[PDB]
Design a binder for this molecule. Structure first.
Ligand SMILES: Cc1nc([C@@H](NC(=O)C(=O)Nc2ccc(Cl)cc2)[C@@H]2CCCCN2)sc1CCO
Ligand SMILES: *[C@@H]1O[C@H](CO)[C@@H](O)[C@H](O)[C@H]1NC(C)=O
Ligand SMILES: *[C@@H]1O[C@H](CO)[C@@H](O)[C@H](O)[C@H]1NC(C)=O
Ligand SMILES: *[C@@H]1O[C@H](CO)[C@@H](O)[C@H](O)[C@H]1NC(C)=O
Ligand SMILES: *[C@@H]1O[C@H](CO)[C@@H](O)[C@H](O)[C@H]1NC(C)=O
Ligand SMILES: *[C@@H]1O[C@H](CO)[C@@H](O)[C@H](O)[C@H]1NC(C)=O
Ligand SMILES: *[C@@H]1O[C@H](CO)[C@@H](O)[C@H](O)[C@H]1NC(C)=O
Ligand SMILES: *[C@@H]1O[C@H](CO)[C@@H](O)[C@H](O)[C@H]1NC(C)=O
Ligand SMILES: *[C@@H]1O[C@H](CO)[C@@H](O)[C@H](O)[C@H]1NC(C)=O
Ligand SMILES: *[C@@H]1O[C@H](CO)[C@@H](O)[C@H](O)[C@H]1NC(C)=O
Ligand SMILES: *[C@@H]1O[C@H](CO)[C@@H](O)[C@H](O)[C@H]1NC(C)=O
Ligand SMILES: *[C@@H]1O[C@H](CO)[C@@H](O)[C@H](O)[C@H]1NC(C)=O
Length: 339
């Protein structure tokens, strides 16, 4: 017998003790080795309710990533609550590794295995595990990178689709690569991201059709963000320790619904911290070619309000709440107390 419960989780990883990469260093001191032969019990005739939007596992992972960034990514200058902190800001080795979240004795993790599970409601095909799958703490906005893919159809996730103030998580079932490079050999902060237009437009059209199913067959329109901070209006992410801000106007341009799409990007030293603190300034980019090839596995969308009396619904790429990023991977898990 069991019941829904919150408890202090621990983590597991395959981090290397000799590696200087900061995720490896953090996990070496904060996690245990993974289980090579993890047990999983599939529960027969069991119906369990899940709520990805109210899941303490998300808050706990958030706390890990914050602590990781606090120890690994201290800026030269920090601006918090009127205070000004000036510390050393050396260049680091940065590349996220998978992190497993696990329950202690007396508790287990219930895993929903329903193929098109949207994150809320009952789940039929439920299994029991001690640890989640390996989740890379990839911090980004607009586009979810290097995540897990949906098994069957593209999944739309929201705490309340009718509420346009609630973020929409689109879970892709097909990866689309994004190739971002700050070239080595005039503007050291100038960069770009290349994406195959054929793949992207094909996928975005599939997302369009899926959104129609959730919005009574209304016409789905994509538009670039209207306003706000650069972290939201642009696709922001971290590559090799460097913060990249990319213009995704070409990606959300309804007309193409075939060549290579080259997004204009820039490496920013001054950033609005995703931790919710204030602003921070980092050192200028390292020398040489800075390159990251990522899979786009999900999209964060915000729907416009005031469209009830029209046949259109307008969606714009958004984000900013990094907890939504962890939700996109933790949606199928919940902790129960074994009694
Ligand atoms: C105070 C606070 N501000 C937050 C803001 N979010 C961010 O600054 C942010 O994501 N920055 C960000 C994102 C990605 C990368 Cl690689 C680096 C920085 C929000 C986003 C939505 C609109 C307003 N800005 S998140 C947060 C607290 C969250 O608990
Ligand atoms: C659950 O499992 C059944 C039988 O294996 C399978 O046919 C079905 O796709 C699953 N149902 C759901 C709700 O995902
Ligand atoms: C998800 O599925 C549940 C039923 O399991 C349903 O009540 C809810 O409306 C769905 N949410 C979305 C985002 O479609
Ligand atoms: C990128 O996606 C591909 C194809 O879906 C997958 O094989 C690979 O593991 C992914 N790479 C990551 C997660 O870095
Ligand atoms: C992805 O999901 C869509 C439905 O959302 C489906 O039509 C398509 O076949 C899926 N693609 C793959 C490769 O499974
Ligand atoms: C979803 O949001 C809409 C608009 O804010 C609201 O009218 C509705 O009551 C919400 N649904 C729930 C279950 O709270
Ligand atoms: C990424 O783009 C760069 C610059 O065009 C190119 O040299 C490189 O081959 C690309 N990488 C991959 C794996 O496609
Ligand atoms: C349009 O979407 C509705 C659901 O909103 C669906 O019932 C209908 O089958 C779709 N269009 C067609 C093929 O009539
Ligand atoms: C993105 O690029 C377009 C021009 O292609 C420009 O008009 C727009 O202002 C850019 N977006 C941002 C947020 O810089
Ligand atoms: C969006 O599509 C239109 C097609 O009319 C094109 O002219 C425009 O350049 C596109 N936006 C881009 C690629 O920045
Ligand atoms: C995208 O991939 C398709 C294969 O589906 C290929 O034909 C095309 O060369 C690629 N487009 C670009 C310009 O990257
Ligand atoms: C995604 O995964 C690839 C392969 O490990 C990595 O090279 C790339 O830097 C990752 N992207 C991000 C944004 O971390």
């Amino acid at each position: 017998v069991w019941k829904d419960a919150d408890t202090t989780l621990f983590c597991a990883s395959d981090a290397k003790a000799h590696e200087t990469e900061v995720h490896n260093v953090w996990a070496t001191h904060a996690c245990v080795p993974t289980d090579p032969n993890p047990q999983e019990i599939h529960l027969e005739n069991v119906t369990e309710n899940f709520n990805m939007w109210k899941n303490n596992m998300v808050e706990q992972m958030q706390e890990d990533v914050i602590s990781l960034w606090d120890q690994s990514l201290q800026p030269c200058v920090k601006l918090t609550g009127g205070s000004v902190i000036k510390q050393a800001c050396p260049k680091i080795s940065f590349d996220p590794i998978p992190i497993h979240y696990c329950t202690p004795a007396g508790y287990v993790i219930l895993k929903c295995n329903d193929k098109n599970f949207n994150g809320t409601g009952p789940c039929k095909n439920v299994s029991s595990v001690q640890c989640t799958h390996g989740i890379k703490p990839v911090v980004s906005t607009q586009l979810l990178l290097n995540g897990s893919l949906a098994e069957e159809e593209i999944i739309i996730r929201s705490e309340n689709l009718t509420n346009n103030a609630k973020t929409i998580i689109v879970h892709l079932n097909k990866s689309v690569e994004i190739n971002c490079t700050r070239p080595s050999n005039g503007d050291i902060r100038k960069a770009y991201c290349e994406i195959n237009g054929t793949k992207w437009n094909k996928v975005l059209k599939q997302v369009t059709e899926k959104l129609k199913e959730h919005f009574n067959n209304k016409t789905i329109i994509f538009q670039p963000p209207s306003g706000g901070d650069l972290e939201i209006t642009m696709h922001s992410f971290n590559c090799r320790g460097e913060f990249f801000y990319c213009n995704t106007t070409q990606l959300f341009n309804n007309t193409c619904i075939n060549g290579t799409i080259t997004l204009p990007c820039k490496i920013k030293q001054i950033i609005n911290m995703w931790q919710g603190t204030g602003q921070a300034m980092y050192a200028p980019p390292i020398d040489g070619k800075i390159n990251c090839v990522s899979n786009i596995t999900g999209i964060l969308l915000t729907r416009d309000g005031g469209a009830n009396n029209t046949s259109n619904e307008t969606f714009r790429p958004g984000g900013g709440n990094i907890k939504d990023n962890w939700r996109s991977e933790l949606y199928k898990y919940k902790v129960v107390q074994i009694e």
